[PDB]
């Protein structure tokens, strides 16, 4: 199925307890690595990362992260100067890639300032999309170094995917498993003359699930309320969908379709 690898960076100027810099990695919804300006160490966040990557890996990336921390500190100072901003502001980065079930791939690299899009890299055109004049100033400086754009295209298309395939093998017993959902339909008259139908699912992995309500075997036109896909705390997830009023709930998960006729 579809899998992804992502790395985030968070920089905070003048932090109140809160680290000045944090960086976390993820494979799908699972945290794999962490670093912050307090520990100043890159550490695993999944036992399958810890057991398959030698101490030299964590040692080398600890040094790189100490450098990337200093880079974030200085870029955020320059951004605050450009905007004429004082006090506490945030700077964020997200880099990563996706390996789609059809073998095709995606790659992304983006920055945010104070939690809003700032610069979005387009690896297919080798350009940065800027949201305002300050972002345009930065885009011009970054686009002036042709080699760094080519390096970034290669990292997103080749290195990121190779790292993702490596980690999928290390964590295959967690990441490639399937735990089917337990699904039920609850019926209840709520406000006089208003019957609510809930289709509730839990105990499933991966978190991706499709739930819908059908009427006489065809697509609905009335309002469907959707519950978020939430972690249950044991590595599995839960979700629900509801309607008010022949109804049937349809659930699709990991290549298995299920129908619950009311």
């Amino acid at each position, epitope marked *: 199925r579809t899998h992804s690898l992502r790395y985030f960076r968070l920089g905070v100027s003048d932090p109140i307890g809160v680290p000045e810099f944090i960086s976390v990695g993820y494979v799908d919804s699972h945290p794999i690595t962490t670093y912050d300006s307090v520990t100043r160490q890159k550490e695993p966040r999944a036992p399958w990362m810890a057991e398959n990557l030698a101490p030299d890996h964590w040692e*080398r990336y600890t040094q790189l992260l*100490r450098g990337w921390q200093q880079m974030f500190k200085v870029e955020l100072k320059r951004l605050q100067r450009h905007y004429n901003h004082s006090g506490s502001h945030t700077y964020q980065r997200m880099i990563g890639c996706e390996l789609l079930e059809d073998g095709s791939t995606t790659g992304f690299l983006q920055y945010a300032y104070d939690g809003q899009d700032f610069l979005i890299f387009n690896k297919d055109t080798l350009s940065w999309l800027a949201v305002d004049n300050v972002a345009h100033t930065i885009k011009q400086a970054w686009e002036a170094n042709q080699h760094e754009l080519l390096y970034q295209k290669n*990292w997103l298309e*080749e290195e990121c995917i*190779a790292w993702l395939k490596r980690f999928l093998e290390y964590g295959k017993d967690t990441l490639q498993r399937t735990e089917p959902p337990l699904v039920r339909v609850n019926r209840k008259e709520t406000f006089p003359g208003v019957t609510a139908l809930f289709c509730k699912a839990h105990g499933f992995y991966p978190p991706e699930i499709y739930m819908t309500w059908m009427k006489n075997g065809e697509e609905i036109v009335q309002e469907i309320d959707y519950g978020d896909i939430l972690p249950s705390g044991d590595g599995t997830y839960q979700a629900w969908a509801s309607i008010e009023l022949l109804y049937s709930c349809h659930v699709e998960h990991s290549g298995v379709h299920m129908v619950l006729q009311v």
Partner: antibody
Amino acid sequence: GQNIDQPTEMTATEGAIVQINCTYQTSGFNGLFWYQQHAGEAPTFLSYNVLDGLEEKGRFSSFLSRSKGYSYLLLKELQMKDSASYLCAVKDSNYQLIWGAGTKLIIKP
Amino acid sequence: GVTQTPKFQVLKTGQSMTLQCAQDMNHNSMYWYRQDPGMGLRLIYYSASEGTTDKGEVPNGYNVSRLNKREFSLRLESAAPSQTSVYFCASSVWTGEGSGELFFGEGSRLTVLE
């Protein structure tokens, strides 16, 4: 990170063309560099390739084939001042530079 | 660019020595290499940014100090004949970047004699 191979030495004639090959076998790839180092002097950056193709900088061109794990440094209209050592270096998955032993280039007048 | 001292040095076995290196290019990453015949450059120690250092491939018999953003000194604790070599300091704008090249110092030729 593992192995870089380039010839120890090459000889060509003034005015002609020379191609210096560099083959690499590494754990990941983040780019290939060429440096020039004159006898008793410091190495100086010549070129960088990370995607497939040929980049020309005056009389020097650097080629890369990612699928073959192969690069070459092409020097045209050879001059006596081109006599030097040429170093090939690859950045692996952890951004460490893997250095080749260098190619001593001798130009015959 | 990169200012490395001394250019030449004769040492007796057991003598201590410090190589200096300074760059005023506002670079964050600094490196100490040794160059020996028939082999590729070998990293001794490096400093990815001010306030951090780590071993390279051949750290034994050496130590470093990233004194400030500009300076990275290399120390030979007890000079040994195996340390006879040409030492190069280098710097780059950052580390953990692909395209950034190295800027090298002029080189320090050390000869260690009994």
